Structure formats: structure tokens, C-alpha cells
Design a protein around this nucleic acid. Structure first.
Ligand SMILES: [Mg+2]
Ligand SMILES: [Mg+2]
Ligand SMILES: [Mg+2]
Ligand SMILES: [Mg+2]
Ligand SMILES: [Mg+2]
Ligand SMILES: [Mg+2]
Ligand SMILES: [Mg+2]
Ligand SMILES: [Mg+2]
Ligand SMILES: [Mg+2]
Ligand SMILES: [Mg+2]
Ligand SMILES: [Mg+2]
Ligand SMILES: [Mg+2]
Ligand SMILES: [Mg+2]
Ligand SMILES: [Mg+2]
Ligand SMILES: [Mg+2]
Ligand SMILES: [Mg+2]
Ligand SMILES: [Mg+2]
Ligand SMILES: [Mg+2]
Ligand SMILES: [Mg+2]
Ligand SMILES: [Mg+2]
Ligand SMILES: [Mg+2]
Ligand SMILES: [Mg+2]
Ligand SMILES: [Mg+2]
Ligand SMILES: [Mg+2]
Ligand SMILES: [Mg+2]
Ligand SMILES: [Mg+2]
Ligand SMILES: [Mg+2]
Ligand SMILES: [Mg+2]
Ligand SMILES: [Mg+2]
Ligand SMILES: [Mg+2]
Ligand SMILES: [Mg+2]
Ligand SMILES: [Mg+2]
Ligand SMILES: [Mg+2]
Ligand SMILES: [Mg+2]
Ligand SMILES: [Mg+2]
Ligand SMILES: [Mg+2]
Ligand SMILES: [Mg+2]
Ligand SMILES: [Mg+2]
Ligand SMILES: [Mg+2]
Ligand SMILES: [Mg+2]
Ligand SMILES: [Mg+2]
Ligand SMILES: [Mg+2]
Ligand SMILES: [Mg+2]
Ligand SMILES: [Mg+2]
Ligand SMILES: [Mg+2]
Ligand SMILES: [Mg+2]
Ligand SMILES: [Mg+2]
Ligand SMILES: [Mg+2]
Ligand SMILES: [Mg+2]
Ligand SMILES: [Mg+2]
Ligand SMILES: [Mg+2]
Ligand SMILES: [Mg+2]
Ligand SMILES: [Mg+2]
Ligand SMILES: [Mg+2]
Ligand SMILES: [Mg+2]
Ligand SMILES: [Mg+2]
Ligand SMILES: [Mg+2]
Ligand SMILES: [Mg+2]
Lengths: 209, 122, 120, 114, 56
RNA sequence: AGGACCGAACCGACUAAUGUUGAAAAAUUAGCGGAUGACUUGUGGCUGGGGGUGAAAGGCCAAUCAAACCGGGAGAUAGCU
RNA sequence: CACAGGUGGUCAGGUAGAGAAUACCAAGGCGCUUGAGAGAACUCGGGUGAAGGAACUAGGCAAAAUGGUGCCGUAACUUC
RNA sequence: AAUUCCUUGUCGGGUAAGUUCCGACCUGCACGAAUGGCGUAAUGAUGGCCAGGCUGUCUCCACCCGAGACUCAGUGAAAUU
RNA sequence: GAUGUCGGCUCAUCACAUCCUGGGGCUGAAGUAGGUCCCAAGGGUAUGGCUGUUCGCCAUUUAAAGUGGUACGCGAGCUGGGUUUAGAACGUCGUGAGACAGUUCGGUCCCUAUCUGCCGUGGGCGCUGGAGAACUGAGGGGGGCUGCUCCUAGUACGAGAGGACCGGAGUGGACGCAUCACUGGUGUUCGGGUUGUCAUGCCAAUGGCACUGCCCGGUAGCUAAAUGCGGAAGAGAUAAGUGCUGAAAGCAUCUAAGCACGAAACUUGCCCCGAGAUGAGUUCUCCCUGACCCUUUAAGGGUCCUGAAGGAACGUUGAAGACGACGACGUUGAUAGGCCGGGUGUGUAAGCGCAGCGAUGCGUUGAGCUAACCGGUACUAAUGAACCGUGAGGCUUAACC
């Protein structure tokens, strides 16, 4: 149950002959090259490190270049790892295409959500706004009370307050695989996946199914 | 999107002219009722010598909304006003005998098949 | 948020921004080199360059279009008689921003913006 | 994007008639009652058109049984079987939402006799 | 709101531990006139990248 | 004709927000009331403190009023801190 | 205080307008003695809002809404 | 009842549901005839209640335009301790 | 020498004496539905009418509308209706000033956060040569709700009326996360219409101002009402409880030895953070192989040469962002602007011609213009440098060669 690394191409639709419009996200899954294979005897855990895309040889550093050269593969845009399940053996430099998902029905797609910056409590935590009229003094979208009195005499950890919202790892689970088009390196999943267009995406087979 | 206090027209001959939603039946904290959802209503205006009288509290199914319904291809069917068909409070069968104006295929269920038959246009 | 948005508010309202850039576009056409703040210079590119490309094909319609965005016929005339024929073969990029230190009164990052062929 | 546009291109309908806002059109859509699948007609004036390729849509407004009904059709959906222009109207605006406030005479579009 | 106790010179100094200015790391030399100047900026005499952009 | 009507100047001050180390020791902004009258305003004058004045709120009498202010008795007295 | 306050009289252009309201201008006078960026939360001052429409709230507070001129038409009650 | 404690009295009306409202009843804790009784057109920035219109008041907030807030340069407080 | 007081709002947090959902014993438990008690705190746990009300009553919901602690939680968070200042009145009491055993109309809610705490986000150093990339998971956080319908089956049960357990499927409510393809809102940076007025010499054509003058549409972005997904299954150990074998105590006995099951609680399983986890871990890659001098002779100090990997700085910037930070790019270049083509939006420009007395209409013409979008394109701007960071990396012991 390893996954591939893809790029969010955008959203579109697919009409079925049965008169249904499936909302789909297009994911470009180029070949994933295996750059390193980790095992128990050496790394304590079984996994494979993959690369995808192409990076300009001017921007790749000498440490990164040597790590690729050991595998004998070309420099991709990044390095990602996937944990191997029992009975899954890969070799370095082997290329893994999108047709791995040819027969999987639901996938989990993990991306980095769109960054909303410093958000208020209303937007970040669905805090109800206070009255817009009726005498409310400068306290329309403010958070309200944040604790009790002397007995706690403090604010508890995890209190819902204003701060950075978005731009964080988030996984959407169990999205139907609409189409696996190996020729164009495309994966069509039903629904919306996190991130902006052009962001990186990790697609694994669904873990709950 | 019908909620409490919403004033609806009546699409049947029960005698009511304008009703007001006093509860969106279904689950707890439920906010809206779309086409095909049963609501509790109160009669605000009724014709003389009708089957129902003003001030009566009964149920009704919504059949037309300005919000409209969406279809599995993404199309929309929105109407110019919100209308309902009055139902018996305990059996939830229509109390009128004639349906006026169009209805939608969202009503094509075992419960409201009578409304489908009497409608002039679905 | 600000995602994918364009334009610079420049701590003005819409009417003030539009009027100011009319004056600055006129000034740059008249003198072929002016000294503004770096942010203001970067935005003038998006007002003057469209005006020069417009001046490449001379017509009564295009000259009335320039007059609408410039409100000065001397500027319209230099754009259509002098700058259009001058940049007839240049595929965009008619201006050059050179950063020139900081203003003494408020430490604003300044810059010179000139036409790329101003010379002498 | 060259990947999405190509993708959408092969899904588009090839012969879709030309029509503008104000045109009275008859749209034949499919109603599928399990095994029984037939066509139903919807005729009214086009009051809005969204030109977005595969995502193109248009809004048809009719007065049915004393009730105003608006229907938004997705132009390239397989549900919409065909579109035919019954009458060409002469309007000056892309969107005719002002017709929602007009009734009977005053809600009629003059005919584009050209 | 106000302090219940006066803050110490220790606490004052520790807040200004991040107020230190930074010098310009290096200054670029013009390949024609040899003046030192800010990088990406014109020289004091109107030269930039070897060419004399400003007359004065 | 009119302590008539609508409405600027002008005279007020009902509501709300702002502001509350204010732009302002009472305002600003949007609305609000009267606007030929028991109206409003300029300049000068008169009434003096248990006194004045008050379409009366203990209101006002120089940002002070159930007894002004300034000096004096006076370092009142203080079983209180 | 180089303070959004207060301060009596005189003068009265054009166009639209009943008008000294108001909008835009004249003559004349000014841009209000910190600026430059950025384009978060939140605050202030505004614009618009699907469906609903007072369900808000102590209370329709606030907002929205009405708004002109001519003709027609206009109820109970009345001290006419 | 600007007055009724018991009291959200009882009856009627209005609402889906009305401690408020309107009309009554009289059992007026504790109305009442110039410290006026009762009624009354018009008037009222007067108190309560209802309806139409109307809407971000609210369901439930979204977006946008500006002024602050944030960064840089200059000037440079305050309460408190 | 002041601890703001009722109710509401916003935001909560805990307890379990449990309102719902879960598990069970007994029933005066046929079924359905209950009663009562035990276990269980994971999640969930109405909107209105009236009244300042908390409550209460009522209306209509829901699986349920739990009970309590938290300064009867929460006014340096809001409100200010009640209460409890000064005005006024009624009833009442008093000769009265006034007062209430009452009631009624009106009536200024300040604080720029130093410390703690909390939500976010950086800088420093450390981690023992330096550096880049990938991880392991100590630990921490999040999530955990449920209705209805159909099948099993009109079966078991029941005289009938009625009507299941167990098990399987479908479809909702609420809540949450993401996203903008669709439906939409907004879009004072796009197009158009139009009022008053001023100006560009005039006509025509345009611009300014009047809330964007007023409006009608509307791209990108953001976004909800829009649409996709989630709660789980499973596993371990259990609670109440149910047993199996089995003595003490020839019997019996779930327990003493031994063994089996048993819940939304617990530990996992799912998602996120996470080696400052000073117990600072691991993997893979890259870089630096110079010469001397002096002393007190040390993990010593200096001199010349050298300056790496890499980083930073600067520049162009970004669906990244308060600032930092993070990401892309800097000519061997599509990073931003411009330009070119397209798309989209608006809706047939201007000029000219024709028709008409004219307003205007028609033709040229789906014209003109077109912001954030798409595809391109080095025209402009992203510079040769310089800067930081060095020169093979302690001691001990063990194994090995
Ligand atoms: Mg962002
Ligand atoms: Mg205040
Ligand atoms: Mg406010
Ligand atoms: Mg851009
Ligand atoms: Mg500023
Ligand atoms: Mg303007
Ligand atoms: Mg500092
Ligand atoms: Mg008068
Ligand atoms: Mg005022
Ligand atoms: Mg008046
Ligand atoms: Mg008094
Ligand atoms: Mg005084
Ligand atoms: Mg005295
Ligand atoms: Mg004495
Ligand atoms: Mg001044
Ligand atoms: Mg002054
Ligand atoms: Mg005056
Ligand atoms: Mg900023
Ligand atoms: Mg702003
Ligand atoms: Mg609305
Ligand atoms: Mg609407
Ligand atoms: Mg209410
Ligand atoms: Mg309420
Ligand atoms: Mg009001
Ligand atoms: Mg009495
Ligand atoms: Mg008498
Ligand atoms: Mg008497
Ligand atoms: Mg009297
Ligand atoms: Mg009066
Ligand atoms: Mg009054
Ligand atoms: Mg009255
Ligand atoms: Mg400063
Ligand atoms: Mg004290
Ligand atoms: Mg218990
Ligand atoms: Mg039981
Ligand atoms: Mg619990
Ligand atoms: Mg658990
Ligand atoms: Mg509690
Ligand atoms: Mg309390
Ligand atoms: Mg306060
Ligand atoms: Mg407090
Ligand atoms: Mg406190
Ligand atoms: Mg406050
Ligand atoms: Mg009060
Ligand atoms: Mg008492
Ligand atoms: Mg402290
Ligand atoms: Mg969208
Ligand atoms: Mg889009
Ligand atoms: Mg707009
Ligand atoms: Mg949009
Ligand atoms: Mg003209
Ligand atoms: Mg003016
Ligand atoms: Mg559950
Ligand atoms: Mg060096
Ligand atoms: Mg460089
Ligand atoms: Mg033309
Ligand atoms: Mg066009
Ligand atoms: Mg360089």
C-alpha cells in the first residue's frame, strides 16, 4: 500500500451517459522514481523514498546531487517516503507509474491547504459573532469570554483563539477514483482535495475502505 | 430554503391561501426545508367555507421554492414563489384534492405519489 | 487574504489612484525620465506601457482613447507622433526602473523610471 | 491549463445551436424512470447565458401554470438532448433579470426581425 | 492595564536584545567608475552596471 | 388673520454610534424639535450670599452651589486614621 | 495648545432649483505641518448580498424603507 | 387603573403559543369629585400594544471600499510601580 | 485607603447522583412498550409566545431537550431590561420634611496589557568538524453524535389487536474538515446605461465631481446557501454482568489454583503536531588532506597561505505572509511587469454612409473596449562580485584489523 506523489492540476467535471456530473480533481502523477530503499537491518523500518518531476541542475545542491547519483536517477523536485507493507519489494531506480492505482477504488489525498494567514475566531473556529446593534460596544467579532474567574485563574491550553489558519498538512479520505489515465499521467478523483493549483499531493490507497 | 416564520403560498384546494412555517420537522436544530420536506405550518389566511380554517396547526410538504432544487448534472429549477401542499396532521396524507402549479420530481416517492398524480406539470 | 489579486492600493482611494497615475503618466511622457518611489514606479509600468502600445497604431479612435486615459493632447501627440514610431519594433518593455536610494524626508525607497530609448 | 482544457474539450458537444439572450428556445431533456426513458420539453425565453466551455450554462424562464419557473441548463450535459430557437428576440443586455419583475405584456421581447 | 511591579534593567535589556541594527554585508563596486554603491542601486554619480544612466 | 403649516439661516437638544489619558473638563457624525413668536440676537445697565434670580429642576449666580468666591478668626475642633 | 468647540454685523456671480436647501462651478481662497509601505486578526466609517423576513432584542435599538409636482381620490371621529 | 397585595383575578378578543395589550366584570388590599371626578377633537422627539411595507436586527454570516492596527524613517507621552 | 451586584450575550471547563445513545440483573418481563436497579462521562443534549426575569406556564419540536461545581463561571469580553442615586406621579403612611408594607414614566457602564496564562509566529544558542536532504516516534493534540426507512418478516411472540431480538442495506439531521468544478454572493481595479453640472475652443467625442453620483451586469480571488469527504470497522485489556472446571467445606459453589466471554468508557486502530525526546535519535549524500612560530606547554596563543560544501545578503516575487518566516526564480533565465494569441465579461465603439423635419434608427459590426485568468514570448527588471562559513574534527576504554 504505497502511494504516489502528484501535482494538483485543477478541478473540472465529468459527465456520465446516465446524466450525472461528477466533480473531479485532476492530479498529474508523473513517474515516481525510487531513490532509496530502507529496510529493517539498516534503517529499522521498511520504506521507499521516491522522487517526481524534474529540477534544474543549477538549483540542485551537491549533497542532493550525490544522493540522486547513488540511485542513478534524475533529480526530481522533492523527496518523499512511503512505508512498505509486508510483501512489497521495490528496487532503487525503479519507476512507478500511475497505473499502480488501476484497480484501487478509493484513495486518501494529502496536501497542504491554502493559507488564510492570521484568522479571527469567527473564521478559524466558527465562533458566533456578537450583536451587530443593541448597544454592542466595539465587540462585534471579538472572542467573548476566555475563562472563568479565580478558581481556574488562568486560560486552559487548547483554548480556541485567533492565529494562523491554513497552510498546513491536511488529508481528505476515501475519495472515489473516477479515472486512471496512464497515457497522460492523470488521476481523476471525485471531490476537492486540499491545496491550491500546482501544489504537491500524496495519493495513497484508502486506509479505511 | 424554508425556515420558521416563512410565509408560503398553498398549491392545493384545502382552502388555505397563505400559511406560515412554525417548525421545520426532521431532526434536532434542523434549519431549512427544501422541496419534499414536511413542515409544521399555521393557517394565516383561508377562503370562507373551506376545508381548513385560519389558526389551524397542521403539517405541509414543500413543493416549490425560490431556492429551487439542483439536479445530478448541476442544473437548477427555481420557482417564483414558495408553495406547499397541506397534509393531515396525523396521517400525513394530503387533505386537498387538486394540486395547482408545477411540482418537481423530488416528490416522486411512496409518500407523495398522490401529489405527483394530481399535479398539472412535473 | 489577497490571493492572486493585482494592483496596489497605495493608501489612497480608487479615484485618487487613477488621477495620480494620469499625472505621473503625463509626467513621464513629457520628460522621458522621472523620480518617484519604487512602489509607485512599479505601478506606473502598468499604466504607461499600455498607453505606448496603444500609440503604435495611429487612428482617430486610438487618439481619443489616449485622451480619455491622459486628458492632455500634448501627451497624446507625443505618444502618437514620437513615442509610437520610436517603439514601433519593441515588443513591450518600454520603461526602465533604476533604484536610487532613499528619500531624505521620509526614507522612502526611491527609483528613476525612464523610457528605455530616452538617450539625448 | 493544457491538461484540463484538452480533457474538457473531448467532453464538449459539437453541434450546439447559436442563441442569444431574448431568444425563445425549446429544450428537450431526458427523464429516466428506471427502464422508461423519454423526453420532456421546456420552452421559454433565454434570460442569461454563461459561456465557460464545458461549464457553459444558460437560464430559460417560462410562465407555467400561472407560476414563473426558471431553469438553468448545463449546455454540455447529456441530459439536454437538443435545443431549438423558436423565436429571436431583440434585447440590448446580456442578462435579462429585469423580466422577473415584468408580467404579461411588458414581459415580452420584441422580435429580432433581421 | 499597567505594571503591578516596575520591570528591571535586566528585563529592559533582554527585550532590546532584538533591536540591534544590521550593517550592509557588502557594497558592490561599479565596473566602470569604481564607486561603491548599494547592490541594484545606481551609484552616487549616476552610473549603474558600468553605464552612466543619470547625467547629474 | 394665526403662540397656523412644510422647510434653510438662527435657536434648541429626542435617539444612536464614536470618543471616554478625547479633536473637545460635554463634542463630533447621522438622523431630531421650534423656526412671526411666551421668538431670537448685539451693546450697555440693575438685582449680592441665608442674599439674588428661578414658566420650579434645589435650577442658576464666572468649568465651584441644600448656601459662591477671596482674606481673616485660624494652628477652629478631631475620644478618629 | 498653531485645540474638529464658541463669536455680533456687512457683501451675495453662473447652471439646475420654490430657495440664502442642494449639486456642480466663478471670483477668490485652499489640500487641513509627520511621511513611505503593506494590504492579517480586530476596531471605526461605508457599499452590496442567495433563501427567509423581527424568528433579533427589554424594546424594530440600529439599519432598511418612504420621499417631488400636478390632477384624481380620501374613513371613523370632530370643538366644524 | 400611572392606583389591585392576593394576581399571570375571571370572562371575551387578538397569537401556534400573549405575566404585556384591548373590551368587560366588581371581590375598589388601598378610586372619587378644583392637592378636582369623568369625558374629550386636535396636538406630542410622551408610556404600552398590534398590523402593512421594509430590511444583515436575526437564522449565519460572506465579500468589497476607505481610516487605524502591522513594517520602515522622524518626533515621542501616559496611568502605575 | 472599593473583591461591580440580577438576567441575557459570547466563550466555556469539570463532576456523575446518566437526559439520549452503549452494556447488563430483576420484573406483577408473551411480543411491542415499559418499571426498577447495576456498569458506563466517548460524543450529543430545542426553537419560539409571555414576562427584565432565572424560573414558570404554554405552543411546536428532538434520540434526548440531564443535574450540579466553576466569585449562584464569564462587565480591564459585550449588554444594561431588573435592582439601587438625583426628576415626576399614583395608591398608601405621616401635621410635615419625607417614606414604602407598593406600583409607574425618564435616567453617563472608563482602562493603549508590564507579569502569569493562552492562541499564533520568529530570533539566539545547544545537540561536540561543518553542511544539505529524508525520516524514526518519546510524547502531545484532534476526532468519537445520531434519526428514519427498507430487508430478515407480517416471521418469533400473541386469542386477537398488534409485533420483534440478532443480522444486513439505504437515506437524512446536527457537527467538523477541505475545496471553488457546479449553483450563487461579492467583486469602488471590467463593460455598459443614465441625471445635474463643470471643463477639454465649438460640434461630435470624452474626462472630473456629485456615497462607486445613481444604477444594470460581471472576470479572477475570497467565499456559503454550493459539493466532496469524515465519525467507523477491527484489535487488546476490562466494568456491571454471564459462565466452565474446582476444592476449602465427601455436597454445593463463576474463584481460592486454573480457564472462557463481556460496553460509545480505557489502550490502540484514524487524522495533525512532534528529537529542546538536554534521554537533543536514525539514514543517505556532500565538503575541507596547508606551512610555521612562540609560551607558563594547554581541548594554549599568534603569523602567512587558504575560504570549501553550504548559507546568508541583495534583486524579481508568490493562491506564503502582520513582521519575521515559508516557497519560486535571478541571463546556462519565464520570477514579476510588459507584449502577443486566446478566453471571459459587457453588449453592435469611434469615424463614416444612408433614412428621417427632428429625437433617433439602420449599415459597416457581435462592434469596440476588456482587471487579478490561460498559453506563449527575454522587450524591461532580476549583475560580475563581495559577505559569512574553513583547512580532516577531544579524551578514555573495548572489540577489530
Ligand atoms: Mg494566503
Ligand atoms: Mg462606551
Ligand atoms: Mg459598533
Ligand atoms: Mg499576478
Ligand atoms: Mg498611512
Ligand atoms: Mg467619486
Ligand atoms: Mg524591540
Ligand atoms: Mg408656527
Ligand atoms: Mg447633529
Ligand atoms: Mg418648521
Ligand atoms: Mg427634590
Ligand atoms: Mg457653574
Ligand atoms: Mg451654612
Ligand atoms: Mg480661635
Ligand atoms: Mg495644525
Ligand atoms: Mg479652531
Ligand atoms: Mg453664529
Ligand atoms: Mg502589514
Ligand atoms: Mg481593510
Ligand atoms: Mg438578504
Ligand atoms: Mg432577496
Ligand atoms: Mg420576539
Ligand atoms: Mg429570543
Ligand atoms: Mg429607529
Ligand atoms: Mg388604589
Ligand atoms: Mg368639594
Ligand atoms: Mg379637593
Ligand atoms: Mg388633573
Ligand atoms: Mg412641545
Ligand atoms: Mg415629547
Ligand atoms: Mg398616544
Ligand atoms: Mg516608529
Ligand atoms: Mg488596595
Ligand atoms: Mg454511576
Ligand atoms: Mg432494563
Ligand atoms: Mg458521556
Ligand atoms: Mg476510545
Ligand atoms: Mg455547566
Ligand atoms: Mg456570577
Ligand atoms: Mg466596558
Ligand atoms: Mg472579569
Ligand atoms: Mg478583573
Ligand atoms: Mg473593552
Ligand atoms: Mg435600568
Ligand atoms: Mg420591600
Ligand atoms: Mg505575575
Ligand atoms: Mg464557485
Ligand atoms: Mg474558476
Ligand atoms: Mg458592483
Ligand atoms: Mg465569482
Ligand atoms: Mg456635446
Ligand atoms: Mg467641488
Ligand atoms: Mg456511534
Ligand atoms: Mg572568508
Ligand atoms: Mg546574486
Ligand atoms: Mg459605430
Ligand atoms: Mg465581444
Ligand atoms: Mg551575478
Amino acid at each position: 500500500m504505497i502511494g504516489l506523489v502528484g501535482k494538483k492540476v485543477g478541478m473540472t467535471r465529468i459527465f456520465t451517459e446516465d446524466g450525472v456530473s461528477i466533480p473531479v480533481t485532476v492530479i498529474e502523477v508523473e513517474a515516481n522514481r525510487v531513490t532509496q530503499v530502507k529496510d529493517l537491518a539498516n534503517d529499522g523500518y521498511r520504506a521507499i523514498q521516491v522522487t517526481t518531476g524534474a529540477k534544474k541542475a543549477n538549483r540542485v545542491t551537491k549533497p542532493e546531487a550525490g544522493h540522486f547519483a547513488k540511485a542513478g536517477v534524475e533529480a526530481g523536485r522533492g523527496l518523499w517516503e512511503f512505508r512498505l507493507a509486508e510483501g512489497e519489494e521495490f528496487t532503487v531506480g525503479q519507476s512507478i507509474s500511475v497505473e499502480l492505482f488501476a484497480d484501487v477504488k478509493k484513495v486518501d489525498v494529502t496536501g497542504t491547504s491554502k493559507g488564510k494567514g492570521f484568522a479571527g475566531t469567527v473564521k478559524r473556529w466558527n465562533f458566533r459573532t456578537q450583536d451587530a446593534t443593541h448597544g454592542n460596544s466595539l465587540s462585534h467579532r471579538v472572542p467573548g469570554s476566555i475563562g472563568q474567574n479565580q478558581t481556574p485563574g488562568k486560560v486552559f491550553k487548547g483554548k480556541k483563539m485567533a492565529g494562523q489558519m491554513g497552510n498546513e498538512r491536511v488529508t481528505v479520505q476515501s475519495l472515489d477514483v473516477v479515472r486512471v489515465d496512464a497515457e497522460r499521467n492523470l488521476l481523476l478523483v471525485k471531490g476537492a482535495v486540499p491545496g491550491a493549483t500546482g501544489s504537491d499531493l500524496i495519493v495513497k490507497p484508502a486506509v479505511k475502505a | 430554503m424554508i425556515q420558521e416564520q416563512t410565509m408560503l403560498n398553498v398549491a392545493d384546494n384545502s382552502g388555505a391561501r397563505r400559511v406560515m412555517c412554525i417548525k421545520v420537522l426532521g431532526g434536532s436544530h434542523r434549519r431549512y426545508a427544501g422541496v419534499g420536506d414536511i413542515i409544521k405550518i399555521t393557517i394565516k389566511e383561508a377562503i370562507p367555507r373551506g376545508k381548513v380554517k385560519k389558526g389551524d396547526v397542521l403539517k405541509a410538504v414543500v413543493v416549490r421554492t425560490k431556492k429551487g432544487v439542483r439536479r445530478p448534472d448541476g442544473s437548477v429549477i427555481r420557482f417564483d414563489g414558495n408553495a406547499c401542499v397541506l397534509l393531515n396532521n396525523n396521517s400525513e396524507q394530503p387533505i386537498g384534492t387538486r394540486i395547482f402549479g408545477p411540482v418537481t420530481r423530488e416528490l416522486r416517492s411512496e409518500k407523495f405519489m398522490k401529489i405527483i398524480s394530481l399535479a398539472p406539470e412535473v | 487574504m489577497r490571493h492572486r489579486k493585482s494592483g496596489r492600493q497605495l493608501n489612497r482611494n480608487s479615484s485618487h489612484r487613477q488621477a495620480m497615475f494620469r499625472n505621473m503618466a503625463g509626467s513621464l511622457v513629457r520628460h522621458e525620465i522621472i523620480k518617484t518611489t519604487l512602489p509607485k514606479a512599479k505601478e506606473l509600468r502598468r499604466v504607461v506601457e499600455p498607453l505606448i502600445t496603444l500609440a503604435k497604431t495611429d487612428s482617430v479612435a486610438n487618439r481619443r482613447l489616449a485622451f480619455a486615459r491622459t486628458r492632455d493632447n500634448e501627451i497624446v501627440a507625443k505618444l502618437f507622433n514620437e513615442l509610437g514610431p520610436r517603439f514601433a519594433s519593441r515588443a513591450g518593455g518600454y520603461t526602465r526602473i533604476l533604484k536610487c536610494g532613499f528619500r531624505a524626508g521620509d526614507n522612502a525607497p526611491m527609483a528613476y523610471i525612464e523610457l528605455v530609448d530616452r538617450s539625448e | 491549463s493544457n491538461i484540463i482544457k484538452q480533457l474538457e474539450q473531448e467532453q464538449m458537444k459539437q453541434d450546439v445551436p447559436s442563441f442569444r439572450p431574448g431568444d425563445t428556445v425549446e429544450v428537450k431533456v431526458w427523464v429516466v424512470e428506471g427502464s422508461k426513458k423519454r423526453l420532456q420539453a421546456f420552452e421559454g425565453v433565454v434570460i442569461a447565458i454563461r459561456n465557460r466551455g464545458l461549464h457553459s450554462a444558460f437560464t430559460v424562464r417560462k410562465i407555467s401554470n400561472g407560476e414563473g419557473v426558471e431553469r438553468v441548463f448545463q449546455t454540455h450535459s447529456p441530459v439536454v438532448d437538443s435545443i431549438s430557437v423558436k423565436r429571436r428576440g431583440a434585447v440590448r443586455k446580456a442578462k435579462l433579470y429585469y423580466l422577473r419583475e415584468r408580467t404579461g405584456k411588458a414581459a415580452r421581447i420584441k422580435e429580432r426581425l433581421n | 492595564a499597567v505594571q503591578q511591579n516596575k520591570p528591571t534593567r535586566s528585563k529592559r535589556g533582554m527585550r532590546r536584545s532584538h533591536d540591534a541594527l544590521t550593517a550592509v554585508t557588502s557594497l558592490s563596486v561599479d565596473k566602470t567608475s569604481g564607486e561603491k554603491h548599494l547592490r541594484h542601486h545606481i551609484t552616487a554619480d549616476g552610473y549603474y552596471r558600468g553605464r552612466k544612466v543619470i547625467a547629474k
